[model samples]
Target chain A: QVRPFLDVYQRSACQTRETLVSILQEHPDEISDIFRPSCVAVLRCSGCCTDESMKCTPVGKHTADIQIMRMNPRTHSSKMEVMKFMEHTACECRPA
Target chain B: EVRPFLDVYQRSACQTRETLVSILQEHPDEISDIFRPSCVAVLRCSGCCTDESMKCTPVGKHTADIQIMRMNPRTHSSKMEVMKFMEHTACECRPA
Candidate 1:
């Protein structure tokens, strides 16, 4: 499915959800592998996870005068906060 | 939290992670509310989630000649595959 020269949207959104579901269903390790930091190995030693260099920003959510809310206002939470957690999680270099 | 002049990067990135962690921790219903298509209401009825109009592209993950892998590769899993599942899962509009 290449060479059409057209293109694809939802490229990231669609893929992220699929990965999320798969990890949830098949292997509980999904979080560790992707969301976690050790991914630095695959990340070209950018030392992302530790440096907040790893990224996951959505387009629609990206807008002017951005407004964020609770996971359930009643519930004090934010995705940025979660990412912050990862920034400090115990991780290791992928086995070189 | 108004800005003085310049503002923030990773705005969505940080927020999204916090939301994911929160939903995974407290609500578990995060996917249904945020990832699901019915999110159309909050999405300004762009008919997004349904039309694949809603977006979620990460920056670090984006690059020249991007490559993807499996949830385990040993397993038939892809994030895209999971997102596709939500598209067909029985869903409804949020409480109006």
Candidate 2:
């Protein structure tokens, strides 16, 4: 019997990624919450720019570069095709 | 002229370590703070035991295994010899 809370990451195994991702069965609706609000006070902004510092998000919303889904073979293959097609197309938003 | 905060880590150069450590000239009296408190809650401790978790400290005082100081060639070499000698001797505190 496998011990509970004992997740696996067998590096030499091909299904390691798949096995690990499967264990995230719980809800995680909020993937990553950014803890930034207004820009840092101007005095502290100097320290923020130094090496080993919290990278500012430029005080704006950013979108994911790419997204891939893995429900089945068909869903996986279709998303892969869509991602490949978009590289040749230019629908990107550039800031002034 | 080189821009500040754009520090160098030239892999092909021999002086990379020397260059990097030289920049820690600021007051770092409190180096590398450990964020562990009494302990995580029992429920959280279960999660922590799993792969990819904030490692629990089992709760106690701990000391560095080895410390090598660098002041000058004479001091550095003497400490190196002491460290090498200790490895051959026990003096290690492994808990039951």
Candidate 3:
């Protein structure tokens, strides 16, 4: 029960995790009443999960994932190429 | 000498680098007309960016820095939030 790390990658990590996993796998009828409860998780980073000559070290562990797309606060998009790709890039580990 | 890779992350990654270093430091007339033109670099991540299990474990080659906020009259909102955090941290080992 450890939650609350919501920042919503803003969109464009491959089009917001490929449009929230293609609207939760194949258009749940063109999902979007602003995406809904938005949640996705994949996280791996613990010394490359058991290093072996640091297998091409891309910073250890292996899976770190989170997908939460819930929008609809008046679904904003003043489109300057989708607000320049979507914005928040971890301005110094933002988690307020 | 080759450039052109704009993506900008959607705002609130540390308030888009403290509002782009406070509009290049201290109100450059509240800089915004979609504030474009960006470049901020510092990246180090060979290992251990801290997850805690220490005997000072924090592994080797551990450094991570990424400050890339760029745009070109694509209507600048802090370079469209650094092009939506570089298309939501899109990495296939980026830098093309």
Candidate 4:
């Protein structure tokens, strides 16, 4: 079966770095495909730095971040699958 | 608790329309807020035909189309948010 998984994190800057390292370690295979060419384009357009219009900040205003990753069983070995990992600073302007 | 919902349709055209209408009617509030500005941008982009990079064919080539509609929670007014929905010819091409 083809499964899609998404994990969201909201943490402090120190915690963000720690958690990201762990998350990547836990899902190394998926992370590898993220650096691929075709999938890289998808990540760029889906909502990365270019999404400045969205006013998306890291999860905690430079303190937190987010990463999105996807995989396809049918073409995992050959065609690049969909994988997006984005780090956004949390909106500091929001009422704290 | 909040729940993420997804409904897939691969059948007669009328069935697809009916499902979409029913889904929106059932969760009008969430749907409205979720698509407000983002939905309008999607419509405008499609209307201007500026998003040529993303095209729908085969199903959309001859007759496939996407319709985006929105409901306002404050006013309870329902209207078309986007008229035409475009899709890539195949799922592998890209995402919507």
Candidate 5:
């Protein structure tokens, strides 16, 4: 049976999608060569679940690699640093 | 139905009245004497549960009465206001 679109829902539109976000290193002594730090594409959870019964959230996360031009403290030189960033790999409409 | 935890069962916990957080607001329409009005120590919920097929959620809830100050735009005066908020009474792991 098809349930009416009410407070309690049988199913909800909830999923993980990809978006571009800027990632920054939090070291006070270090700096990046890029004009505005760095940007990475990653998956995130969005959308509404049940009206007030449940919430849409990430179920799992996975790490991905990104490259950044960082200043080396010892040599005072810029070099490419391979950095790992975590993103929501999966999502679900779960109980709140 | 009761399910066995096997090796995944860890205790899921929820704090109904977890902590008191101060809430401050500015009067949008009135030129009040007070710069930023505040209500002290409002109780809220917080907790975590082990995730499996089920997720941790509040099983029961209760309404809490809180008082706040409201500024009357016409009179440019402040009055007491009571607001109701929902809070968790109990928590458990339920199927997602």
Candidate 6:
């Protein structure tokens, strides 16, 4: 008694893709700049759930961080910063 | 191992209730009128019919014609308009 719903991507999954991001927040000085020095492969929910009533969303999540770079008028320095991204541990079809 | 998630309103078939709605674009001016514009018992689908290989969704549907009152504030007139609405007869679990 099941019916089929069409989705461009017929399956649902929590996946990851390599993406570039800037996590700069603080500026020690106006002449200096701070930027994220790395690329992050982030987790995301995509595709379609089994039903139209159901939505694919993150069920579990965690925060992640990465290294950042700071360039001053004299020298370039590096430090660890909180990237503040949702690292989804799991994705599931849930009610919208 | 299959676990079926059930909620208070889940597994119910197509639910409908006569809901009053405004047919006029600027209905704030028409609020003073004792008679409203359009009303319809809109069919709403909810919940899930989860099983091993099937998903809960609406089944056979039929379009029903209802008379809607079209309001023209500029002309200060009203007219009856026929509107067709799609209604699901029932809900069933269908193959994914």
**Who wins the lDDT comparison?**
5
Candidate 5 structure, TM-score to reference: 0.34
Per-candidate TM equals 0.16, 0.16, 0.15, 0.22, 0.34, 0.31
C-alpha lDDT of all candidate models, in order: 0.22, 0.18, 0.22, 0.25, 0.45, 0.40
For candidate 2, give the lDDT of residue A56. 15
Please identify which of the two predictions, 3 or 5, would achieve the higher lDDT against the true structure.
5
Once superposed on the true structure, which residue ranges of model 1 sit more than 4 Å away at CA? A1-68, A71-84, A88-96, B1-10, B13-53, B57-96
Any residue pairs clashing in model 2, and if so which? none
Candidate 6 lDDT at B13 equals: 23
lDDT computed for candidate 6: 0.40
Query: Which candidate has the highest TM-score of all?
Result: 5
lDDT, candidate 6, B1-96, per-residue tens: 111212112222223322222222313454433222222333434332323245446666766555544566667787655555565666666777
Per-residue C-alpha lDDT of model 5 across residues A19-82, encoded as one tens digit per residue: 4444443333335344112344456665445333566689998776655445554676775556
lDDT (10s digit) by residue, model 3, range A1-96 = 211112212210111111111223423554444432221111211111111222212222222222333345465422211101121212121112
Chain B TM for prediction 2: 0.19
Q: Model 4: per-residue lDDT, tens digit, B1-96?
A: 111111101110111111012223334545434332232111111110112243222233212223333556688776653233232232112123
Candidate 3, which segments miss by more than 4 Å at Cα?
A: A1-30, A35-45, A53-69, A73-96, B1-96
Over the stretch B20-82, how does candidate 1's per-residue lDDT look in tens digits?
Answer: 111123324543332211111001111112112234432232112212221433444444222
Off by over 4 Å in 6: A1-32, A72-84, B1-96
Binned by DockQ into CAPRI classes (incorrect, acceptable, medium, high), candidate 5 is: incorrect
Q: Residues A3-48, candidate 4: write the lDDT tens digits.
A: 1111111111112121112223334664443221211100111121
Interface RMSD per candidate (angstroms): 15.9, 20.5, 20.6, 18.3, 19.6, 19.7
Cα deviation in Å at residue A14, candidate 3? 26
The residue-by-residue lDDT of candidate 1 on A1-96, one tens digit each, is 121111222222212221111112233443322221111100111121211223433222211222212132334342321211111212232323
Q: How well is candidate 1 docked (DockQ)?
A: 0.04
By TM-score, rank the candidates, best first: 5, 6, 4, 2, 1, 3
* Model 3 chain A lDDT-worst window of ten: A11-20
Pick the DockQ winner: 4
Candidate 6 CAPRI-style tier: incorrect
